[PDB]
Copies of this chain bind each other. A is one copy, B any other.
Amino acid sequence: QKRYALFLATLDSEFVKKTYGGYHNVFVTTFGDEGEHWDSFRVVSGEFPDEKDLEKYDGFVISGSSHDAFENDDWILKLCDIVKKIDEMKKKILGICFGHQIIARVRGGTVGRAKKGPELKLGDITIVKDAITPGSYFGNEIPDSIAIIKCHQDEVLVLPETAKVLAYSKNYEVEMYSIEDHLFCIQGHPEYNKEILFEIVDRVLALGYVKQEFADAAKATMENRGADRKLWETICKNFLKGRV
């Protein structure tokens, strides 16, 4: 009987609540297969599993957040201690955006605002093919690059010593990385889609937080192409469910 815990470090948005019924469903659509049990914990509102229950999960996913992974709010510190414990148990954790950065912070890396500005867009990341086995999480043919909806408010400015870089881009050396066999981290959102992106852009535009030109460029990146969604599902599930 397979069990997976999702740590929701963001609230549900109006668009995500109305269109999908919330981030729980978004994650479960993306990374779930039939027959598994998915428990989510709204860690952003201070809800966590008990320490003693961690052993029954076959793996964990840490979502994105509007919070920064360098902040010191009580629920972030508690998430760092929980992740440390999970890590010591050698349980699988997939970290997405904020989640990638949380794992890095727990492993002694440094997270801060992105040197090369924010990103809200579809982009491409270059695979370090030398660091991947044919037949492992990445499939048989390993592509040169993979398209993903990027999350680049923050970044990992100093990489934990134990991390292996699996992909990079021109403006960021840490797009994807693994630690040992049980931590796997991506600075983009496999679980996002064009509708989710376009809604965020329009709202942050209306707020006055980005220029109209930047918004128009962000959306333009998904006018004629989407992310490699099927490949990300395959990679992420192979890692999290030990499927090699």
Q: Spell out A's residues near B (CB within 8 Å).
A: 10-16, 45, 66, 68, 71-73, 113, 117, 200, 203-211
Contact of A207 among B45, B72, B117, B204 (CB under 8 A): B204
The 4 A-B residue pairs whose C-beta atoms are closest, nearest first, are A13-B208, A14-B206, A11-B208, A66-B209
Give Cα A12 to B207, complex, Å: 8
Which of A16, A203, A205, A208 is packed against the most chain B CB atoms within 10 Å? A208
Contact A73 B117 (CB under 8 A): yes
Give Cα A207 to B10, complex, Å: 10
Name A209's closest neighbour in chain B (CB-CB). Answer: B66
- Given the contacts A13-B206, A73-B117, A117-B73, A211 and B68 also touching, CB distance less than 8 Å: no
Give Cα A146 to B101, complex, Å: 41
Name A12's closest neighbour in chain B (CB-CB). Answer: B208
Q: Apart from A16-B208, A66-B209, what 7 extra A-B contacts exist at CB < 8 Å?
A: A11-B208, A11-B210, A13-B208, A14-B205, A14-B206, A14-B208, A71-B113
CB-defined contacts of A211 to chain B, threshold 8 Å: 11, 45
User: Distance in Å from the Cβ of A64 to the closest Cβ of chain B?
Assistant: 10
Give Cα A205 to B17, complex, Å: 12
Give Cα A13 to B203, complex, Å: 10
Contact of A208 among B66, B72, B207 (CB under 8 A): B66
Give Cα A11 to B214, complex, Å: 12
CB-defined contacts of A13 to chain B, threshold 8 Å: 206-208
Give Cα A137 to B48, complex, Å: 51
Give Cα A71 to B68, complex, Å: 13
Contact B14 A66 (CB under 8 A): no
User: Distance in Å from the Cβ of A46 to the closest Cβ of chain B?
Assistant: 11
CB-defined contacts of A113 to chain B, threshold 8 Å: 68, 71-72
Give Cα A181 to B96, complex, Å: 49
